[model samples]
Target: AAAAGPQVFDVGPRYTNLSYIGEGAYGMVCSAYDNLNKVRVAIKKISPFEHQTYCQSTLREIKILLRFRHENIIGINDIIRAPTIEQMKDVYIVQDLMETDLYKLLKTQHLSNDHICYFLYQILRGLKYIHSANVLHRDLKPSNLLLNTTCDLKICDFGLARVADPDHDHTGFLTEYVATRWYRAPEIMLNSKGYTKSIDIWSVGCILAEMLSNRPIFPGKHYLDQLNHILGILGSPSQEDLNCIINLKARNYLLSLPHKNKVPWNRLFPNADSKALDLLDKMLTFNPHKRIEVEQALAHPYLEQYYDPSDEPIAEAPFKFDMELDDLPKEKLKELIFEETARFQPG
Candidate 1:
């Protein structure tokens, strides 16, 4: 047979493809118009799907999308999947359209302080919602933040996010390798399994610095170097702070590294607004417990103009999500995704 035409699925009644926009590690992305909703949108097709980690990650992403009803978080317009196990070939996630991503925007344009404030505020606001749901967005970085010309920003990609309940008592290690090293929190660098939502705050702090400096604040070579990059800037964590690290190996290594004092905030972010610098300082604190909370970050003077209680959530009863993806056998993963696809049908 000759070359097959591009594959397309009639996912329910809402979306139709216009052209292949791009491809991603998780899936092939195509531009489509939401016929039912009567708007433009983007569709991500996680194809050649395996009932493995990919399924679990997509399940988690979908469930979280269903959990949040906020403007700052990407909204799922529709979902299409193999309706039956015999047909399971891919998972298509339809999300709201965006002109570009923050990563692309930052690389090309010179953003202003006002732009940074607004962008950072939306990020914190969305994060406030995620954290309030007891979900930790472990992967908060520039690429994951989608944006359009109207200044609208939404958070996306949940492959690495995990449910972190502070109230529950449990003892198991969460992976320290979840986030991109440059933006990863120091606690993660030290391999602290007990790290918290504060880790997300640290990533945001790095993003803020990148916006100001037009480069990553800590471009480390690897895990060890990432730690050194952070320590090289913020200096050493206090002895009290060191005591909190439960990873003995990491703690010992941290102790062995040559002591270094934090480069002055002014030097790190020269020409930055005083208010913005203070907020960054709070977020980048060495102690995870001491780092600024998402809610607090929203209220900082730097974001005073955009700070609105309505933008962030206080807290709520724990969210209910069933994503035992990591350990689930491939068969179970397939069943879950199939059921999820069947359950979701746009009106």
Candidate 2:
């Protein structure tokens, strides 16, 4: 019987015998060998100009991957584009191949204490770089975290990430649905006028909890149900917490919920190391301002084993993503993507 996978798409002759790995709304992915680089790589084929929002996401992810090159962040090996901008239909991104994502790994195997600690350490370390670059990984979850057979975790999928411009205020206008509900931060769920990098920290907390428990910490049935799950454990928000909600209706809805007591961290994650739980507690704080920063989390005792000031690197300059790309015409967007991919080609 012939091996079954996605039918190989035209991505140039350098890659051959494509085997489907996975796919989503964005596009499909397959494993292929890079003839030029002489290594196994994953090729993501995307019809980038399908929709305005989706096109912007594809561009953003490409730019982010190009700028960010770190050990714990997925690296782009090469990018393949159509020979002519006018002929552009599908763009292919060549990236390092990983065994699987954390979502699949957790379903089959429970990690040990050391595995959890190391994973958390790498996550924070990578995030420190991302945050320093003034970018927020708006969508972070287990499925987005790719894992190698050696236990190395690489943060992937930056389609939803955005540049955090210090001068521009993003409170009321920021998109509300940046992440999947189960791992979404409370402030985001409540439609906070503006949010910060700490939202990513909240997601890390959710991922850590899932790693520890082998299940989603707050598996709500719907959007509001998700918030209820969080409040039920973290307890109802205070006056200040409610104030963080810039959306009047969202704040009032929270105020209407019956007051609840905070669930003790130890009780919720019994048998977990105190230090791990301590880190988890700080990461899961309902208030974004009060939530632990990436640098601080890296310094926590639980991850002390992997911490090294000299080794943990931050981006030297903040990444500047063009906001105008979102409104560009399909032809212009295609040209931009083609130009980006061309950079990797030999001059």
Candidate 3:
């Protein structure tokens, strides 16, 4: 069935006054009130002129999103297409608002092991669904994983995702500079072609390490430096990895480094349980062929006993609007778009 259009609400001249949330390569996100429903929602207003690449990416994202439905994946309430003065350009996408992202939560010093497990389990579940649909989320970072008030994780930002077809190579779809350096998979770091869902597994491993240590495992200034940092901890790739590295654009970079010492998972995550460490090792394997699959990761003892997929507690309180409930003003809508777009401007 076709999804119903967004419930249009009038709150003063513009929707409720929008508050800035965050900025990204594509556009800015803001928190706005749907006065009619009295719900707080996130409206992502893409700049028609500055975000052309993001517009294309957003189209791809919507197509991929429409194919899957899972609690752990971010939900799309409505897609708004506000026309601009330029005939070819139009504003796009209004979505559910999340309180904050996992990246911000990791800054704290006291996250419990259970907290980590629960969050990681949610991520794995989301990834499993994506893989099941034969899609690869080429970018998976803490910043892209949002949290509701109850701390439930929802994977978002499919701008870099691509549908994987096993019958053909997808190396051409991969950009040399796609994912965040710290969370990127080794295959991507080495600029490998024909990479698969394992790229996301690699990123999950990096996020896991960061959560546990409260520090980035591979903090490199440049691509080569990043490779060196990762190799320093995880050891050099074996012949298997070298053979498959041929398709990457930056294969020459991999050849420039000498083989390094191996850093055992136990040492990296000394305080974590043995099982958790084991899973981390599998996810961080240098050889993509050896990386753990999402389904297998879900069945790991670390996740099986602790994470519950059935719970659906309302994570956040019902959204409140600053405008009077009885009568919404007109200016609210325009103000919401203006406030949302302000953040994306280059400083």
Candidate 4:
């Protein structure tokens, strides 16, 4: 007899007890029991060829994940292959099921200083490897950070990531709408020139502060509100700071706004560890150039107890995407996804 529950997934015979878990902008997820692995796993079903841009992102994520295999980075257990070309529209990615995401966990649970530092340690360790690969995780947020019962955290959701290099600077001119407003860096919000990997660092800072307080530090209602929320706490930027914004109209708009005082971190997070707060301040610097790098954050005193240089590693080679895939038509994308998925299937 077939399993009693609703078969919401088309995942193979190896998987059972399919329960619809949740949905995201790009995919629908289901939790299932894996007979082969003898454990539960989350399978995300994605329609690869639905849109040209979405297809490109899907391909980029697959290629990047295959290369970035750090302990704190989410790993792909398998890609369920379709039996026929006609049925290959939807692709299923299998991974170990995390107990919860940081977004959900932060709302209900309180974290200790030790827990916060450990989590931050893992995030930076993973990010170091990613940055070394010259890739930017443009959409870092609480939801994208997965947590298990043991308190191990893994970074997920690489759909918005883009490759950056010294000569070819894609980091400049990033879409202002890339990351969630609350976690986005000042340069990203302002559409400034030459923003670097510190965009991810800003996001880590926001997550750290949220963990300390158990609430979003900059919960802005809208885009303009988001900028105000940041300025309200960090205070107004200097004329030198305003120079980074290439758009004269935007720079003038900030000049027109009333001056604000920078709120002291101690006052905002009085109960938190002073070292932790100090690290948070550095990570959240308004100037992208002035922000702490991931390696620096890992070495901060707040994380000194958990940081181990031998344990942390950087990527040996950069993960480069097949540029041709970006402009491929739906049919070609379908064929490419089929070939890629087929490689993971066993005879």
RMSD of each: 3.1, 2.7, 11.0, 2.6
Clashes (N, CA, C under 3 Å) per candidate: 0, 1, 15, 0
Off by over 4 Å in 3: 1-14, 48-51, 83-92, 166-175, 189-191, 240-256, 306-347
| Model 2 bad stretches (over 4 Å) | 1-8, 165-176, 191-195, 243-248
TM-score of each: 0.90, 0.92, 0.77, 0.91
Residue 52 of model 2 has an lDDT of 72
**What lDDT is reached at residue 337 by model 2?**
84
Q: Judging by TM-score against the true structure, name the best candidate.
A: 2
Q: CA lDDT of each candidate?
A: 0.78, 0.83, 0.67, 0.81
Candidate 4 on 1-347: residue-level lDDT in tens? 23323434677789888777787666678788999979999988787677877777787678788778899999888998567888676788999899889999888989888888888899999999999898888778899999999999999988778776435333333344745788877666566423368888888999999999999889989767878889999999987888876666667778899999999999999999999999999998997878899999899998888888888999998777776665688777777667766768774
Per-residue lDDT of candidate 2, residues 114-175 (tens digit): 99999989888899999999998977899999998898989999988877643443343224
lDDT of 4 at 36: 91
Give the per-residue lDDT digits (tens) of candidate 1, residues 238-260: 89988977667767877887788
Ranking by lDDT: 2, 4, 1, 3
Model 3, 265-326: lDDT tens per residue? 77887888778888888888888777898877887888976544354222222122233212
